[PDB]
Write a protein that binds this ligand. Structure first.
Ligand SMILES: Nc1ncnc2c1ncn2[C@H]1C[C@H](O)[C@@H](COP(=O)(O)OP(=O)(O)C(Br)(Br)P(=O)(O)O)O1
Ligand SMILES: [Cl-]
Ligand SMILES: [Cl-]
Ligand SMILES: [Mg+2]
Ligand code: NA
Ligand code: NA
Ligand code: NA
Length: 326
DNA sequence: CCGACTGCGCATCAGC
DNA sequence: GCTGATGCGC
DNA sequence: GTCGG
């Protein structure tokens, strides 16, 4: 990667602002600058050259100059030496522990994996599962395992009702050679924007995946969104596979294209594309694209027959999933 | 100079 | 219980 | 932290 030193710096700065400063717009500004620099096809020689790119302003250009001259950023060197920042950043690596809870735990003297492990009763259910699988959730998933997981999920969904359609999205659908988790978009003709003619549509699928011991834990679960934990089966004498995060999102079948656009991402790609829609007078979510009136009020959903239709409304050339990894 | 920054489901809690 | 934040992770 | 008007 051509500018990895710079993008790593900006990412660590983004994480500092989110986790410690609790400054969500600085976090997003740093992530935006990292993303645009990551796609820039030249090795950056100067902060001024970087400042040409949209999202790199004066302050990041200065940081880039410092990094290029010295190989480091004093601001980050000091953050790394600060105990409270160090503790908060570590605690937020547990799934379910965010900026707020991390800072509250540090106040209470809970500041290490050992402290968490002996204070399990101070964790909510999500945090408790996050701690249990702390090590596993740091491991990435090779695409070859994602293919096995996909096969299980699709076949088990088929056994519940052959009219379900499950689509693995996320980085997998963008063609990545490894993924951080598995994201599954689910549809069924009974659930549309017009009516829900069968209950428990998501529950049935989760239950079947639990039945065959693929889903092992639940982080949260409602009528349309499941977040939990899964594990591939292993063979005789073989070490067990790590536990993996799995998300399942049930979307109205007639809104599949907005939903698969959303769940394919990346997150920054969605953010960039939704920001462009707003400039063009539309708002995009995982359900619909709608015009915005002058009052800022969204209007009726526009018809959508493909992912490209959504690109067309906002006057973007279509981008294949493999080219949305921003 | 400064308002606006993508969008939302599920968990948790406060106030009534 | 309901309603409306706030937190969190997508 | 960045940027459009
Ligand atoms: N804040 C956000 N805003 C808009 N869309 C978002 C979003 N967060 C997530 N999405 C959309 C967009 C996103 O692609 C999808 C899945 O969210 P994952 O967190 O699983 O992201 P992924 O791409 O699968 C990665 Br590379 Br992080 P992996 O999980 O393989 O490590 O939900
Ligand atoms: Cl901010
Ligand atoms: Cl909508
Ligand atoms: Mg994912
Ligand atoms: Na710029
Ligand atoms: Na966390
Ligand atoms: Na996910």
């Amino acid at each position: 990667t051509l500018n990895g030193g710079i993008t790593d710096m900006l990412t660590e700065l983004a994480n500092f602002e989110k986790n410690v400063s609790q400054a969500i717009h600085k976090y997003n500004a740093y992530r935006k600058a990292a993303s645009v620099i990551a796609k820039y096809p030249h090795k950056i020689k100067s902060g001024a050259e970087a400042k040409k790119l949209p999202g790199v302003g004066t302050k990041i250009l200065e940081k880039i100059d410092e990094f290029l001259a010295t190989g480091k950023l004093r601001k980050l060197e000091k953050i790394r030496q600060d105990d409270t920042s160090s503790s908060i950043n570590f605690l937020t690596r547990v799934s379910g522990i965010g900026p707020s809870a991390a800072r509250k735990f540090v106040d209470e003297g809970i500041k290490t994996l050992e402290d968490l492990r002996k204070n399990e009763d101070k964790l909510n259910h999500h945090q408790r599962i996050g701690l249990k699988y702390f090590g596993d959730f740091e491991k990435r998933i090779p695409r070859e395992e994602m293919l096995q997981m996909q096969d299980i999920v699709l076949n088990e969904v088929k056994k519940v009702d052959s009219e379900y359609i499950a689509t693995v999205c996320g980085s997998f659908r963008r063609g990545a050679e490894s993924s951080g988790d598995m994201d599954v978009l689910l549809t069924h003709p009974s659930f549309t924007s017009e009516s829900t003619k069968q209950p428990k549509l998501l529950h049935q699928v989760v239950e079947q995946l639990q039945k065959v011991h693929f889903i092992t834990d639940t982080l949260s679960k409602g009528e349309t969104k499941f977040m939990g934990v899964c594990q591939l089966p292993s063979k005789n004498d073989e070490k067990e596979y790590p536990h993996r995060r799995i998300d399942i999102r049930l979307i109205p079948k007639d809104q599949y294209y907005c939903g698969v656009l959303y769940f394919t991402g990346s997150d920054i790609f969605n953010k960039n594309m939704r920001a462009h829609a707003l400039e063009k007078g539309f708002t995009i979510n995982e359900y619909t694209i709608r015009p915005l009136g002058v009052t800022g009020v969204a209007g009726e959903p526009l018809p959508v027959d493909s992912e490209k239709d959504i690109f067309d409304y906002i006057q973007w050339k279509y981008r294949e999933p493999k080219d949305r990894s921003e």
